[PDB]
């Protein structure tokens, strides 16, 4: 029920002139810790009705359970990323750890069916660029950066007059309009189809997606120093006989929890309609 990571603040430069003392300066520190609290599960009983129904229907259920658990895993990671855009760093370690990043962009959605459909892509590119600007101000290295975009945002991005054009340098960057946006603003992009809806999430009551959190359809984070996943029970599957209820029950349960180390290394864009 705990995995701990320590944190450390910076110093401050002062100045003496000829004979004045050197005022000592403290340096502050603190810790961070992720805890595991919820175990997911899928229960599936069969009331000894496999005797009559020849098909097993037991190898497809395993694949379905694996797919659903992967879905929930990816969705939980994305939810953690987008819910940390409002995290405020403590003052006692503020100069090193900054706040979260949220960038607002206005999208006409499907209400635009003209040359204005190119205005959405420009806004998307501008929001991503502003997030990169924030990250570079925080001096975060961009070698390991990555961008995830929802399907609709990917499509709206595809109609961009300045980014999929060979004039603006498409020697190896975005060389085709046929749904292969690969890198923009200098970092790779991946079309993710697992951005959360407005409902709740099984991993906990602190995960339920608000109305505003559903608008967030783009993230930008480092693959190595932004998210940490803490494992307690690895994903296991089990089938066990139930004499008393006269059924066979198939279980699939996993236990983990995702936390953010350096929440100031992620850029989240909220697309607040029009």
């Amino acid at each position: 029920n705990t995995y701990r990571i320590d944190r450390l603040n910076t110093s401050s430069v002062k100045g003496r002139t000829s004979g004045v003392a050197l005022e000592p300066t403290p340096v502050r520190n603190d810790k961070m810790l992720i805890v595991v609290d919820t175990v997911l599960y899928i229960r599936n009983p069969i009331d000894y009705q496999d005797d009559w129904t020849a098909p097993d229907f037991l190898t497809e259920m395993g694949q379905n359970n694996g797919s659903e658990f992967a879905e929930v895993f990816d969705q939980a990671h994305l939810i953690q990323l987008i819910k940390g855009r409002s995290w405020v760093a403590p003052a006692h370690l503020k100069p090193a750890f900054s706040d979260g990043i949220e960038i607002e962009a206005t999208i006409d959605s499907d209400v635009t069916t003209q040359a204005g459909m190119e205005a959405n892509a420009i806004a998307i590119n501008q929001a991503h660029k502003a997030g990169i600007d924030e990250l570079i101000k925080r001096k975060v290295p961009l070698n390991d950066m990555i961008t995830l975009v929802s399907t609709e945002i990917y499509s709206l991005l595809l109609e961009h007059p300045k980014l999929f054009n060979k004039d603006w340098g498409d020697a190896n960057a975005n060389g085709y309009k046929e749904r292969r946006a690969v890198l923009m603003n200098g970092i790779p992009v991946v079309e993710c189809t697992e951005f959360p809806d407005a409902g709740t999430h099984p991993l906990g009551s602190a995960y339920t997606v608000t109305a505003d959190d559903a608008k967030c359809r783009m993230v930008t984070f480092s693959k190595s120093r932004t998210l940490v996943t803490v494992e307690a029970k690895p994903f296991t599957s089990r089938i066990w006989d139930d004499e008393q209820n006269f059924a066979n029950v198939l279980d699939c349960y996993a236990m983990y929890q995702v936390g953010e180390r350096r929440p100031d290394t992620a850029a989240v864009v909220k697309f607040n309609e029009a």
Binding site: D30, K31, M32, L33, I34, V35, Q80, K83, G84, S86, W87, P90, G100, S205, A206, Y207, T208, T210, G259, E260, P263
Partner: peptide
């Protein structure tokens, strides 16, 4: 402490 570090959305925690 879990609410502050390891960001948990405080609108529901």
């Amino acid at each position: 402490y879990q609410a502050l570090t390891q960001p948990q959305d405080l609108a529901y925690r």
